[PDB]
RNA sequence: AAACUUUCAACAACGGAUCUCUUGGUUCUCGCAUCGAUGAAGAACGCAGCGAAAUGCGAUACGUAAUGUGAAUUGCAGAAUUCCGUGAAUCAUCGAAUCUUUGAACGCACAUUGCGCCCCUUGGUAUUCCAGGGGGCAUGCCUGUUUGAGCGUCAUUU
RNA sequence: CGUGGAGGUCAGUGACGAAGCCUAGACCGUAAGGUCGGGUCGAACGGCCUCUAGUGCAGAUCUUGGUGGUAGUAGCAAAUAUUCAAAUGAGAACUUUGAAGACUGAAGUGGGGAAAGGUUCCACGUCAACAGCAGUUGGACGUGGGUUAGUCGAUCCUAAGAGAUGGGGAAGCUCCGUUUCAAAGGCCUGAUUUUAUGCAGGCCACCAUCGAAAGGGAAUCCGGUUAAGAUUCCGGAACCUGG
RNA sequence: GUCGAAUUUGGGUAUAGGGGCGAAAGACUAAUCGAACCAUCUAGUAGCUGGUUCCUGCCGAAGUUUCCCUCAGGAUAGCAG
RNA sequence: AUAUUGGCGAGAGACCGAUAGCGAACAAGUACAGUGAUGGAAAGAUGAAAAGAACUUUGAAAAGAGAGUGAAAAAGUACGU
RNA sequence: UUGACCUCAAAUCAGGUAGGAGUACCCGCUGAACUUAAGCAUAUCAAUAAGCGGAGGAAAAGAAACCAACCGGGAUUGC
């Protein structure tokens, strides 16, 4: 068993870990397969910008305060401030949270 | 077994038809790899088991 | 080199598609390619053909029957005689052959122009 | 004698041909085929036996319907007749 | 003697033969051959004989 | 993973004057009573069967990877290293070799090959088309049947059709300045390659 | 309660799982109500259920079912989703109100063992993912 | 060469029925003389003729049955196209495409518009 | 000294190793979503001029109908000339049919190729007997229709 | 040092001939091994700089296959049995026929069957294989023929028992019971003259199905006839059931 | 030894795995049973036997300390590269 | 957006090369064993093309010796080396 | 006596649907032991394998009775 001067390793390989092993040989193959999905979307989505526009919103918690990230939607106060109604942003391609 | 049943007899009639060697023409066919009847069945060495 | 993603370059499939293939190839002579503007045509049972490669080089004849099991044709006159007195035809592969006279009824009358020919 | 002299006292039949699979596994007294199950409404196939399942799955028979299903979908399940193109 | 169909019975034998060969049947005796076929003995009445009937259809 | 283990065998133990390896059951087939499971047997599993999660690809430092490629680029110069891999350029005015950028806008292979032979790369082209031998290994019928030598390589800044004008002639390979594959600049881990530069590509190198 | 079907009380195991009479089953009697009713009439689809009455020996429920092969439900596209084949035997897979509660799928840190499926979350978190490039 | 395919298509219904017994009898004759000599390859070329005439009867007979049910619903099951079991079940294109009153009012009022960025 | 034993070489035997080939297996990757009461998966039995087996098929039986290609199949026999043309092909495609007895098995049964019932029609001097031919009779459940049952119970003349 | 494969190189070797194998022939290395000559043989292979691993053999009562000495040995010794002549055949202690001598001694070494076997039954031709000797002989080989039912049985009834409904359990595959908490059925008279079969009364209530080719059971025998069939076929003579 | 009976036996049926059945012997349960056969977990674990596949060059030991339900085993120190 | 040794259709490899690789490169879930659940192999390469041996002789034949075919039967079907 | 309501039924009433197969992925139920603990009873193996019910090309989850306490974020799913 253990002996000499080594750290006390705890390896969680006691179960039948071999029957569930998700190897990732595809990776690059899936990368091309997702370029195809992105490329074909750009055609049938009409000459549209694809991704919507997301708000500039401050990050939560203590450590993540110096940086500002992208949110999910422009609430309703900003939507009403812009003048356009709530459901018109979705048609024009603006996400609303 | 003398007092037989048609289900059994229909199987034996199938066995009689298939209890034959190869006709000679088979061996002369193009790209033939067959030389013997590997499914040969006899009443002494093996039993059908119906 | 191969560019499409639909044709194989593997030997196993390439040979498999050759031997285990259904029924459904000789070129033409210099005069025919200077008269019909076509290089190759399928072989038929009523074609005059001249041998260019092999031991029996130069002996011309007519195909007696295209035998698609051996993947070779049998020229009527080009044959070898057995010891006992009979004679059997020798298989000839159409790629080593040259057709000089055709047999065109309506279809070979049509295959010529589809392949950029001008017929007669 | 528990050996050779007792092997000549056996002339009866315990199992018989199964009307559903013909493997001679239809127990007479039990009236239940031991290979597939009959007249049960389901064919018995246990995951602890894998060779037995491999002997009776799809592909060991003729596939009188499924050899054409791939072909039928291969075009789109058309119906009707065909047209005349040329020649 | 004919190689009759397996599904047929002496009721369907006594009528099919008399419609093709226009001869009545005294009785029919039928056995199953051990080769997978069925055999049938058709005895016509005394008003006819099988000799000129067997050859007229071709077999004799 | 199921190879060799499909056969259900049990050890016969001791007392029967045979090896106590697992013997399969049943009878009347010639396989019954034979060995199984162990790698010493016939038809059993191989010792520690190879499994899919071996380390196939190995990571390399990005800076180190650029270092060897930069070293390989220096190996394209210096005449002595070039001749160490064949590369019959003994008759060449100077190394490196610089050609006009019009070679990029060549469309016909016949004119493309003639352009290389005019410079002096004919011997390198002539080195190929003579070494087309078979493969000694059993992989010659594993879609690796034929092998050749490596001819000159062409480096171009902007593609104008040269890639299709040289992709058919054996030995000649084309690569942009951006890619500059190390597998092409030093095959077999041997320094020195007869790389053909162009005016546009040689200026973009710096 | 759910008494084990073990014969004569024998469990044939460690002295840990030696109890037979004091196991409580893992689904509510409401789920069994849907199962025994959704199986008698296979031409229907189970929508929901609710408690109506009870006594010392039984628990009574009344199950509401929909017919997707009826032309009324085939039209009136408010309820077209019950006609989709993916909703075949919803209660058998625990997709009803009691099903989503018996297996405990809900939002919150109080549900982390079962938040996207107890088995799927286990397999997702108990597995070795090996990339091409071992970092 | 037995019989041809399209020549007997123009034949009447009664004439095709009498064509079977013409073929059916000569089969009974070919069996009688087949045993006489061990060669008779002509039986195959016309046993494929009895099948062709039988097939043409059904295609002509099914057409009359089909024409009777045109216009009305509830045609015989085998006349209905096979598809698969799943495709025959589920929702028709009308049933699937149907939408409720409220959602439709939203759709015409607020469709999804197309746009891009130029400046 | 022979016979005999042993070693080597030459040749010849038993034997199948070694080298080289594979109309195979294994793994990875890129796409698709198509079983079954319109009765499937599977099983039995039969079908080719001469075949047992594989393969295909279902007394329309190595299969019929349709389209395309276009002058064959082959071991032999035989059939051809249908081959300058709605025509060959153990061809390809396949959108129309046949699809035996079974099988979730569907009239009841089934280690007995057993026993039933209903409709149409034909024959047997026949609605009631028999036979032939054609078509039907499984269970749970949904909607609707039609017949009912219940001093559960409501109005109405008695 | 060597083995299977991968990158580069020697424009490396090669059907006027590669690889492989044999060779008390030669050379080099202490050795792992390498090189050459000869014979055999016909499609690929080698040196070097590196990479990779399912990489080395005498035995693990090691796996598979094959062959030895033993060895031409042990043995082919129970059931009281053989001999002569002819025929056939290249080839007779064994085949056939004839003549003797015996045995089973009719609780057969005889005639028929049940279960089981499945064409072993019979005919023609035939000996490479099996008949632990042999064999022109065969229950073997190749090709064919043969099983005829109103009366014989299965079909039908039920025994011990199995088991489907209505129901009650069980997450469930299914378990209990099978007449028990189920409103569970057809049936003769009459109506007739669209009533086809409905309708108006008399009615009875049994209450799935399976389960014993020696349990119960409607009815036939004789003569003769095949290479192989018969209470089945031919002839003659019967009886039962339904109408 | 017994032999017309708590006799012998055919066919159908019922009882099945820690379960059946036992005029009991831990007997029988289809050559296996004081505890059936088959498949899976399973390549079950072993401080215990056996084997563990090329050359040469250089160096080259131990059966001793302490602890352990430890004395046909480990850890620590030692010897060694 | 995620998984997918099952089904169909494809492209590949520093994989295995037929005592290996799937059990099966072959009439392979095949022969065969077991009353049963189940177990389950062996088997590739004559030659380019059968041209696979006319005919003479010996023998009863099987076959041998010639001849002949074929580059070569030291390639003759119990057939690469 | 007639005509409505509610409940329960009958038919080879009109029209429909469900059973089985495959399970590689997916949704649940039920559910061990070998083994590790250099003994063994919690534990680990394992909320696994076997057994059962259920679907699709994906299944599931999915627009918070959420995470956070931060200048708060904001359906679900996967790395």
Please give the Cα distance from E25 to E14 (Å, whole number).
6
3-class state of residue C11 by DSSP: helix
Those residues with Cβ within 8 angstroms of residue D31's Cβ, 6 or more apart along the chain or in another chain: D39
List C-alpha distances in Å: A37 to A44, C68, C82: 11, 47, 69
| Long-range contacts formed by C1-9: CB under 8 A, 24+ apart | C1/F167, C1/F168, C9/F143
Sign of CA dihedral B34, B38, B42, B44: positive
Name every chain F residue with its beta carbon within 8 A of the beta carbon of A20: none
Say how many CA atoms lie within 13 Å of F94 toward its Cβ: 4
- Residue G66 in tokens: 């929909």
CATH of the domain at C47: 2.30.30.30
* Range(s) of the domain holding residue C51: 1-120
Q: Which DSSP string do the residues of chain B spell out, in sequence order?
A: --S--HHHHHHHHHHHHH-----GGGGGSTT----S-TT---TTT-----
Q: How many Cβ atoms are within 10 Å of C51's Cβ, its own excluded?
A: 18
3-class state of residue E29 by DSSP: strand
Say how many CA atoms lie within 13 Å of F159 toward its Cβ: 10
Strand M proximal to A20 Cβ, under 7 A? no
- Residue F183 in tokens: 């597998």
- Residue D9 in tokens: 């006292």
Q: CB-based contact (8 Å) between F47 and chain G?
A: no
**Nearest C-alpha in G relative to H102:** G78
From A46, A48, A91, residue closest to H110, measured CB to CB: A91
Instruction: Give the residue before each break in chain B, using a C-to-N cut-off of over 2.5 angstroms; say none if it is continuous.
Output: none
Helix (H) or strand (E) holding E26: strand E25-32
Q: How many Cβ atoms are within 10 Å of G48's Cβ, its own excluded?
A: 16
Helix (H) or strand (E) holding E56: helix E50-56
- Residue H10 in tokens: 């123009």
Please give the Cα distance from C41 to C28 (Å, whole number).
7
Name every chain H residue with its beta carbon within 8 A of the beta carbon of D79: 81
Please give the Cα distance from H96 to C90 (Å, whole number).
68
- Residue G96 in tokens: 């009803």
Taking the CA of residue A60 and the C1' sugar atom of nucleotide I148, their distance in angstroms comes to 75
- Residue G110 in tokens: 């109080």
Please give the Cα distance from G64 to G80 (Å, whole number).
16
**Nearest C-alpha in B relative to E33:** B13
Strand K proximal to A18 Cβ, under 7 A? no
Compute CA D23 distance to the chain's CA centroid, rounded to the nearest angstrom.
Answer: 9
CA angle (E56 as vertex; E55, E57 as ends), nearest 5: 90
Subunits touching A (CB < 8 Å, at least 3 pairs)? F, G, H
Please give the Cα distance from F125 to F114 (Å, whole number).
11
Protein residue minimizing CA–C1' distance to I80? H1
Q: Measuring CA to CA, which residue among F193, F46, F165 is closest to residue F107? A: F165
Residue located via tokens 């099951």: H77
Q: Measuring CA to CA, which residue among F85, F114, F102 is closest to residue F192? A: F85
Please give the Cα distance from B48 to C10 (Å, whole number).
46
Please give the Cα distance from F179 to F201 (Å, whole number).
12
Helix (H) or strand (E) holding A80: helix A77-82
Taking the CA of residue G37 and the C1' sugar atom of nucleotide I146, their distance in angstroms comes to 29
Give the nucleotide at minimum CA-to-C1' distance from G114.
Answer: M61
List C-alpha distances in Å: A77 to A53, A58, A82, D65, F127: 17, 17, 9, 62, 76
Strand M proximal to H86 Cβ, under 7 A? yes
**Residues 50-79 of chain G sitting with CB below 7 angstroms of strand M:** 69-70
Please check whether residue G49 is in contact with residue G30, taking contact to mean a CB–CB distance below 8 angstroms. yes
Chains B and D touch (3+ CB pairs under 8 A): yes
Please give the Cα distance from D24 to D39 (Å, whole number).
14
- Helical axes H42-68 vs H13-34, angle rounded to 10°: 160
Q: Give the gap in angstroms from C-alpha F141 to the nearest C-alpha of chain G.
A: 28
Residue located via tokens 């899936």: A30
Strand I proximal to H48 Cβ, under 7 A? yes
Protein residue minimizing CA–C1' distance to J117? B1
Q: How many Cβ atoms are within 10 Å of F166's Cβ, its own excluded?
A: 24
Method used to determine the 3D structure: cryo-EM
Please check whether residue C89 is in contact with residue C78, taking contact to mean a CB–CB distance below 8 angstroms. yes
φ, ψ (nearest 5 deg) of residue G14:
-55, 160
Please check whether residue E52 is in contact with residue E58, taking contact to mean a CB–CB distance below 8 angstroms. no
Please give the Cα distance from F72 to F175 (Å, whole number).
14
Please give the Cα distance from E33 to E8 (Å, whole number).
14
Cβ burial of F139 (10 Å; 0-12, 13-18, 19+) is exposed
Q: Measuring CA to CA, which residue among G32, G26, G4 is closest to residue G103? A: G26
Strands F153-156 and F195-198: parallel
Taking the CA of residue F41 and the C1' sugar atom of nucleotide I9, their distance in angstroms comes to 39
DSSP conformation class of G78: G
Q: Which residues, listed in sequence order, are joined to residue A22 by a DSSP beta bridge?
A: G129
Q: Number of structural domains, chain C? A: 1
Q: Measuring CA to CA, which residue among F153, F162, F174 is closest to residue F102? A: F162
Chains G and C touch (3+ CB pairs under 8 A): no
Q: How many Cβ atoms are within 10 Å of D49's Cβ, its own excluded?
A: 11
φ, ψ (nearest 5 deg) of residue H108:
-65, -40
Strands, E, within chain B: which ranges? none
Chains G, H: CB pairs < 8 Å = 24
Taking the CA of residue F29 and the C1' sugar atom of nucleotide I105, their distance in angstroms comes to 38
**Residues 12-51 of chain E sitting with CB below 7 angstroms of strand I:** 12, 15, 36
Q: Give the gap in angstroms from C-alpha B10 to the nearest C-alpha of chain C.
A: 38
Give the nucleotide at minimum CA-to-C1' distance from F15.
Answer: J61
- Residue D34 in tokens: 């031991």
Compute CA G47 distance to the chain's CA centroid, rounded to the nearest angstrom.
Answer: 13
Stretch 89-108 of chain G: residues touching chain F, C-beta under 8 Å: none
Q: Which DSSP string do the residues of chain H spell out, in sequence order?
A: ----SSTTTSS-HHHHHHHHHHHHHHHHHHHHHHTTSS--THHHHHHHHHHHHHHHHHHHHHHHHHHHTTTSS---TTTS----HHHHSS--HHHHH---HHHHHHHHHSPPP------
Strands, E, within chain G: which ranges? 45-54, 59-66, 128-130
φ, ψ (nearest 5 deg) of residue E13:
-85, -45
Name every chain H residue with its beta carbon within 8 A of the beta carbon of G70: none
């Amino acid at each position: 068993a253990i002996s000499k001067n080594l750290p006390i390793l705890k390896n969680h390989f006691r179960k039948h870990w071999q029957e569930r092993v998700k190897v990732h040989f595809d990776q690059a193959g899936k990368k091309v397969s997702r370029r195809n999905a992105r490329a074909t979307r750009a055609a049938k989505i009409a000459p549209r910008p694809l991704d919507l526009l997301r708000p500039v919103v401050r990050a939560p918690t203590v450590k993540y305060n110096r940086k500002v990230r992208a949110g999910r939607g422009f609430t309703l106060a900003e939507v009403k401030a812009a003048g356009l109604t709530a459901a018109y942003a979705r048609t024009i391609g603006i996400a609303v949270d | 077994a003398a007092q037989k049943s048609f289900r059994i007899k229909q199987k034996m009639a199938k066995a009689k038809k298939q209890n034959r060697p190869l006709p000679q023409w088979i061996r002369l066919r193009t790209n033939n790899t067959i030389r013997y009847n590997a499914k040969r069945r006899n009443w002494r060495r093996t039993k059908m088991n119906i | 080199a191969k560019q499409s993603l639909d044709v194989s370059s593997d030997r196993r499939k390439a040979r498999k598609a050759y031997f285990t293939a259904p029924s459904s190839s000789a070129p033409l002579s210099k005069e025919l390619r200077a008269q019909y503007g076509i290089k190759a045509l399928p072989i038929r049972r009523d074609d005059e053909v001249l041998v260019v490669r092999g031991s029996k080089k130069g002996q011309e004849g007519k195909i007696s029957s295209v035998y698609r099991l051996k993947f070779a044709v049998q020229v009527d006159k080009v044959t070898k005689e057995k010891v006992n007195g009979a004679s059997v035809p020798i298989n000839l592969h159409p790629s080593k052959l040259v057709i000089t006279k055709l047999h065109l009824d309506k279809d070979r009358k049509a295959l010529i122009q589809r392949k950029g020919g001008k017929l007669e | 004698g528990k050996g050779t002299p007792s092997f000549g006292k056996r002339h009866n039949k315990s199992h018989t041909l199964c009307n559903r699979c013909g493997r001679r596994s239809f127990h007479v007294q039990k009236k239940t085929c031991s290979s597939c199950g009959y007249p049960a409404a389901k064919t018995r196939s246990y995951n602890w036996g894998a060779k037995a399942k491999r002997r009776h799955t799809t592909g060991t028979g003729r596939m009188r319907y499924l050899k054409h299903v791939s072909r039928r979908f291969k075009n789109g399940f058309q119906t009707g007749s065909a047209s005349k193109a040329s020649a | 003697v004919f190689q009759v169909s397996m599904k047929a019975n002496k009721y369907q034998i006594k009528k099919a033969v008399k419609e093709l060969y226009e001869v009545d049947v005294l009785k029919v005796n039928t056995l199953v051959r051990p080769n997978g076929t069925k055999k049938a003995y058709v005895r016509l009445t005394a008003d006819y004989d099988a000799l000129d009937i067997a050859n007229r259809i071709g077999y004799i | 993973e199921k190879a060799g283990h499909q056969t259900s065998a049990e050890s016969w133990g001791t007392g029967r004057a045979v090896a106590r390896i697992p013997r399969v059951g049943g009878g009347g087939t010639g396989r019954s009573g034979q060995g199984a499971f162990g790698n010493m047997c016939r038809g059993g599993r191989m010792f520690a069967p190879t499994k899919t999660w071996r380390k196939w690809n190995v990571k390399v430092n990005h800076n180190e990877k650029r270092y060897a490629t930069a070293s390989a680029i220096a190996a394209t110069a210096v005449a002595s290293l070039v001749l160490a891999r064949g590369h019959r350029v003994e008759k060449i005015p100077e190394i490196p070799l610089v050609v006009s950028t019009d070679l990029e806008s060549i469309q016909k292979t016949k004119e493309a090959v003639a352009a290389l032979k005019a410079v002096g790369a004919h011997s390198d082209l002539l080195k190929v088309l003579k070494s087309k031998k078979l493969r000694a290994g059993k992989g010659k019928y594993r879609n690796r049947r034929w092998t050749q030598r490596r001819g000159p390589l062409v480096v171009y800044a902007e593609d104008n059709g040269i890639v299709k004008a040289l992709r058919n002639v054996p030995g000649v390979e084309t690569a942009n300045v951006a890619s500059l594959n190390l597998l092409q600049l030093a095959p077999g881990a041997h320094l020195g390659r007869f790389v053909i530069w162009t005016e546009a590509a040689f200026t973009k190198l710096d | 309660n759910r008494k084990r079907p073990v014969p004569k009380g024998a469990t044939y195991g460690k002295p840990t799982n030696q109890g037979v009479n004091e196991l409580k089953y893992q689904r509510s009697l409401r789920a069994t109500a849907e199962e025994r009713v959704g199986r008698r009439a296979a031409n229907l689809r189970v929508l929901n259920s609710y408690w109506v009455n009870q006594d010392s020996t039984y628990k009574y429920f009344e199950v509401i079912l929909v017919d997707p092969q009826h032309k009324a439900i085939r039209r009136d596209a408010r309820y077209n989703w019950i006609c989709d084949p993916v909703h075949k035997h919803r209660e058998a897979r625990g997709l009803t109100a009691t099903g989503k509660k018996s297996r405990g799928i809900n939002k919150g840190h109080k549900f982390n063992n079962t938040k996207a499926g107890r088995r799927k979350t286990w397999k997702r978190q108990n597995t070795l993912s090996l990339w091409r490039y071992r970092k | 060469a037995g019989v041809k395919a399209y020549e007997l298509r123009t034949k009447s219904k009664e004439q095709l029925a009498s064509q079977l017994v013409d073929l059916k009898k000569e089969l009974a004759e070919l069996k009688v003389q087949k045993l006489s000599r061990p060669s008779l390859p002509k039986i195959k070329t016309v046993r494929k003729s009895i099948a062709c005439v039988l097939t043409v009867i059904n295609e002509q007979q099914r057409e009359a049955v089909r024409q009777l049910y045109k216009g009305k619903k509830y045609q015989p099951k085998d006349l209905r196209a096979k598809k698969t079991r799943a495709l025959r079940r589920a929702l028709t294109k009308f049933e699937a495409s149907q939408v409720t009153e409220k959602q439709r009012k939203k759709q015409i009022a607020f469709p999804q518009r197309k746009y891009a960025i130029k400046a």
